[PDB]
Structures are given as C-alpha cells and as structure tokens.
Amino acid sequence: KIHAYTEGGKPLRTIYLPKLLKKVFLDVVKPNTKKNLETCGILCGKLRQNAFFITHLVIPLQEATSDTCGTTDEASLFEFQDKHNLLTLGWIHTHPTQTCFMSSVDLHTHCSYQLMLPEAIAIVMAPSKNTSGIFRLLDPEGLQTIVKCRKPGLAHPHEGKVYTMVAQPGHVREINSKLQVVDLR
Ligand SMILES: [Zn+2]
C-alpha cells in the first residue's frame, strides 16, 4: 500500500501513531503550557511485523524554559524504557505561544533520535495557534548539516534545507489505538 523512502533512498518502516496522542499530550502538560513553559515527551513503542507501534508516551524528568525542554535524568528514562522493553521512536514537545516549526535546538535534539532510528519523528504542538506538525531531518543531508554545525547560540540559523514535514501519506500512519501516558516527573 505505501513504500516510504529517505532523501537518499533508504526505506522507512511504518510508525503507527495513536490518533488521540497529541490531544492527550496537551491535556497532560497543560499546567506548563499555562506557564509558557515547554514540555517534552518520548514516543515509545515496539516493532511488530516490520512496523513500529507507539504504545507509550513517556514524560521524563526535565528542565523547561520558554523555548527549550530537555530530559534531566536520562538514566531513569532509559531504565524505565529497558524494564518495559520500550523502543525510542521519536519525541513530542509544545511551543506554548510560538508557531509550529522546529527551532535550532529542536534540530540538534532530533539529530540523536534520527541517527539511532531512521524513522524517528519530532511532533511539535503549537496550542495557542491550534496547529501541530510531524517533522524529520533530511537524511542524509540534514543530519550531515546538523552534525557538522558548531555555531554557538540557542537560536543560530542553519544554511540550506535541513528538515521537512513527514509527507501524507508517508511512513507515519495514525490509527485508533489505545495509549498509556507515563509521567516520571
Ligand atoms: Zn521546539
């Protein structure tokens, strides 16, 4: 039905994302959003039948400013994921007030995810605009750009085309599947 490929021709397995996940994330992190504070979640799940299924939205211990969030205890996150056999399939965060895009920081953050898993996605929620989007870096070229980049500054720009929206249809398929939210904070 659908065969998806990277910019360099590599095949991308499907990620099934529960249709309710995005709203549910917003509900759970609402107290931070009210404070104009970003919140991050990890999209975790399993590989079955050559496809990935997001089963768990994991909210780690984290530090949030108005334009960054970052997990602060990677070990507790990684041990929770390993105890329950949960793969890392991508990540989701809010822009409480800004528009829907990937910031400089977002691109650097996503590069880890996508180097480990070519299918890895970044979901960005812009609740004050009622918009959202699912993104990824161009592979290889955007990944190359970000890895080579040494610029200082939280908001530094990037030369060239670096990231893109996941296409519709594409390797992400939204389905009516259940969701478990795990809050580790
Ligand atoms: Zn962001």
Ligand SMILES: [Zn+2]
């Ligand atoms: Zn950079």
